[PDB]
Design an enzyme around this catalytic site. Structure first.
Site, mmCIF file in Angstrom:
data_model
loop_
_atom_site.group_PDB
_atom_site.id
_atom_site.type_symbol
_atom_site.label_atom_id
_atom_site.label_comp_id
_atom_site.label_asym_id
_atom_site.label_seq_id
_atom_site.Cartn_x
_atom_site.Cartn_y
_atom_site.Cartn_z
ATOM 1 N N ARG A 1 0.303 9.482 0.567
ATOM 2 C CA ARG A 1 -0.928 9.262 1.940
ATOM 3 C C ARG A 1 -0.957 8.438 2.909
ATOM 4 O O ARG A 1 -0.882 9.204 4.057
ATOM 5 C CB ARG A 1 -2.657 8.999 0.930
ATOM 6 C CG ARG A 1 -2.398 8.030 0.438
ATOM 7 C CD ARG A 1 -3.582 7.535 -0.203
ATOM 8 N NE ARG A 1 -4.284 6.344 -1.279
ATOM 9 C CZ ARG A 1 -4.029 5.118 -0.877
ATOM 10 N NH1 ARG A 1 -3.486 4.334 0.482
ATOM 11 N NH2 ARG A 1 -4.314 4.552 -1.713
ATOM 12 N N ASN A 2 0.135 7.720 2.664
ATOM 13 C CA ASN A 2 0.474 6.531 3.701
ATOM 14 C C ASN A 2 1.441 6.741 4.747
ATOM 15 O O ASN A 2 2.412 6.241 5.100
ATOM 16 C CB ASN A 2 0.491 5.251 3.136
ATOM 17 C CG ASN A 2 -1.037 4.590 3.003
ATOM 18 O OD1 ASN A 2 -1.652 4.960 3.648
ATOM 19 N ND2 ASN A 2 -1.504 3.594 2.129
ATOM 20 N N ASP B 1 0.633 2.552 6.960
ATOM 21 C CA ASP B 1 -0.240 2.094 6.830
ATOM 22 C C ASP B 1 -1.870 2.562 6.845
ATOM 23 O O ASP B 1 -2.185 1.977 7.533
ATOM 24 C CB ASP B 1 -0.512 0.801 6.201
ATOM 25 C CG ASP B 1 -1.285 0.235 4.904
ATOM 26 O OD1 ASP B 1 -2.007 1.471 4.388
ATOM 27 O OD2 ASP B 1 -1.085 -1.002 4.607
ATOM 28 N N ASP C 1 0.799 -1.363 0.481
ATOM 29 C CA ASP C 1 -0.495 0.111 0.099
ATOM 30 C C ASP C 1 0.716 1.451 0.012
ATOM 31 O O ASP C 1 0.463 2.078 0.819
ATOM 32 C CB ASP C 1 -1.035 -0.121 0.865
ATOM 33 C CG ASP C 1 -2.518 -0.661 1.513
ATOM 34 O OD1 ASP C 1 -2.192 -1.363 -0.153
ATOM 35 O OD2 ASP C 1 -2.471 -1.229 2.421
HETATM 36 C C1 LIG Z 1 -4.762 -4.648 9.760
HETATM 37 C C2 LIG Z 1 -3.196 -3.568 9.817
HETATM 38 C C3 LIG Z 1 -2.409 -3.945 9.652
HETATM 39 C C4 LIG Z 1 -1.414 -3.190 9.559
HETATM 40 C C5 LIG Z 1 -1.478 -1.977 9.153
HETATM 41 N N1 LIG Z 1 -0.231 -1.430 9.520
HETATM 42 N N2 LIG Z 1 1.353 -1.645 8.573
HETATM 43 C C6 LIG Z 1 2.164 -1.088 9.628
HETATM 44 C C7 LIG Z 1 3.715 -0.715 8.742
HETATM 45 C C8 LIG Z 1 3.535 -2.275 8.220
HETATM 46 C C9 LIG Z 1 3.969 0.126 7.516
HETATM 47 C C10 LIG Z 1 4.392 -1.299 10.045
HETATM 48 C C11 LIG Z 1 1.787 0.447 9.566
HETATM 49 C C12 LIG Z 1 0.163 -0.059 10.173
HETATM 50 N N3 LIG Z 1 -1.041 0.658 10.513
HETATM 51 C C13 LIG Z 1 -0.410 1.775 10.815
HETATM 52 O O1 LIG Z 1 0.244 3.512 10.429
HETATM 53 N N4 LIG Z 1 -1.269 2.678 11.810
HETATM 54 C C14 LIG Z 1 -1.709 3.613 12.117
HETATM 55 C C15 LIG Z 1 -1.755 4.851 10.712
HETATM 56 C C16 LIG Z 1 -1.849 6.182 11.439
HETATM 57 C C17 LIG Z 1 -1.996 6.478 12.476
HETATM 58 O O2 LIG Z 1 -2.767 8.084 13.240
HETATM 59 C C18 LIG Z 1 -2.960 8.949 11.924
HETATM 60 C C19 LIG Z 1 -3.670 10.172 12.855
HETATM 61 N N5 LIG Z 1 -2.765 11.363 12.312
HETATM 62 C C20 LIG Z 1 -2.497 12.226 12.924
HETATM 63 C C21 LIG Z 1 -1.832 13.491 13.525
HETATM 64 O O3 LIG Z 1 -1.285 13.778 11.801
HETATM 65 C C22 LIG Z 1 -1.228 12.129 11.348
HETATM 66 C C23 LIG Z 1 -2.564 11.581 11.286
HETATM 67 C C24 LIG Z 1 -2.475 5.827 13.541
HETATM 68 C C25 LIG Z 1 -3.392 6.074 14.778
HETATM 69 C C26 LIG Z 1 -3.136 5.711 15.873
HETATM 70 C C27 LIG Z 1 -2.804 3.395 15.333
HETATM 71 C C28 LIG Z 1 -2.315 3.817 13.999
HETATM 72 C C29 LIG Z 1 -2.511 3.851 13.035
HETATM 73 C C30 LIG Z 1 -2.693 -1.121 9.283
HETATM 74 C C31 LIG Z 1 -3.577 -2.137 9.422
#
Ligand SMILES: Cc1ccc(-n2nc(C(C)(C)C)cc2NC(=O)Nc2ccc(OCCN3CCOCC3)c3ccccc23)cc1
Length: 276
Positions: A143-144, A157, A139
């Protein structure tokens, strides 16, 4: 089992200061976390909505299980989970400037090329570590990428946390779900284009079938305005049809480091989709 990869946080040490986003099954907040050393830091906080099921709990915490495996300056940092009290929570580092694509759109042409390459180097370094760990992101998109108050960029992500994302996906992954670190490198090429174009949408709003067909025929996104030739060539290399011919992330980091150390090389510039 989440506790294999995630620290259990005492909710007494968490303050929720603002609801940032909300959905049908959860909310994203910002707040503060008091560390065991008593230091207090800014955090983001994902909460499950009241009344969730056990399966929702399991799926929710599955995200933290994955995140907690990666400890890197350019990957979103998991601070921990709340599981002993309700609502269940996932707590991460706080990225003041949000998603990179929307941040760059607010600041069109307002950063130096070196600043942009710094961002891209950080992203590449986080991806190098992910691929070292055998994890295919699938992904990867601007945006990510989350960017903090000092413009440090971190792989997240957020998208999945909040179908194949066609614009960011390599031809072979679209064709038959061949996802590898080389398909992430293709995605990284698109992020490179997104950054140098200050958050323009890849392939704009072309029909998805035409994005697939054009790329398959050899067409590529055009160089962004004033794009350093070295960076456009790097995009084209990330977008090689043959996945074996794409650069490795370690090479990408190396190339960007060389450009940063020798800024003069970035003064050589390029001049709807391009075939040749
Ligand atoms: C099912 C699933 C499994 C894994 C993932 N996954 N995989 C990864 C790796 C592999 C890149 C490490 C990272 C992630 N998940 C994420 O990146 N998760 C998140 C993103 C942004 C957030 O906060 C955004 C809010 N924040 C506010 C301030 O301004 C910036 C954004 C989050 C706030 C609380 C909890 C998780 C957050 C995702 C889903």
């Amino acid at each position: 089992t989440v506790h294999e990869f995630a620290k259990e946080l005492d909710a007494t040490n968490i303050s929720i200061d603002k609801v940032v986003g909300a959905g049908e099954f959860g909310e994203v907040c910002s707040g503060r976390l008091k560390l065991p050393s008593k230091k207090e830091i800014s955090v983001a906080i994902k909460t499950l909505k009241v009344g969730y099921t056990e399966k929702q709990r399991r799926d929710f915490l599955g995200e933290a299980s994955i995140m907690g495996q990666f400890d890197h300056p350019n990957i979103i940092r998991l601070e921990g989970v709340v599981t002993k009290s309700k609502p269940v929570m996932i707590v991460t580092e706080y990225m003041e400037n949000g998603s990179l694509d929307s941040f760059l759109r607010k600041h069109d042409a307002q950063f130096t090329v070196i600043q942009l390459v710094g961002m891209l180097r950080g992203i590449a370094s986080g991806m190098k570590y992910l691929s070292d760990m055998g994890y295919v992101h699938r992904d990867l998109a601007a945006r990510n990428i989350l960017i903090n108050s000092n413009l440090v960029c971190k792989v997240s992500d957020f998208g999945l946390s909040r179908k194949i994302p066609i614009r960011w996906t390599s031809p072979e992954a679209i064709a038959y779900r061949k996802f590898t670190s080389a398909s992430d490198v293709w995605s990284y090429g698109i992020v490179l284009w997104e950054v140098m174009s200050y958050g323009e949408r890849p392939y704009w709003e072309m029909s998805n079938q035409d994005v697939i067909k054009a790329v398959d025929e050899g067409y590529r996104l055009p160089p962004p305005m004033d794009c350093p030739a070295a960076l456009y060539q790097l995009m084209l290399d990330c977008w090689q049809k043959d996945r074996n011919n794409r650069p490795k992330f370690e090479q990408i980091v190396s190339i960007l480091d060389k450009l940063i150390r020798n800024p003069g090389s970035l003064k050589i510039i390029t001049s709807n989709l391009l075939l040749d």
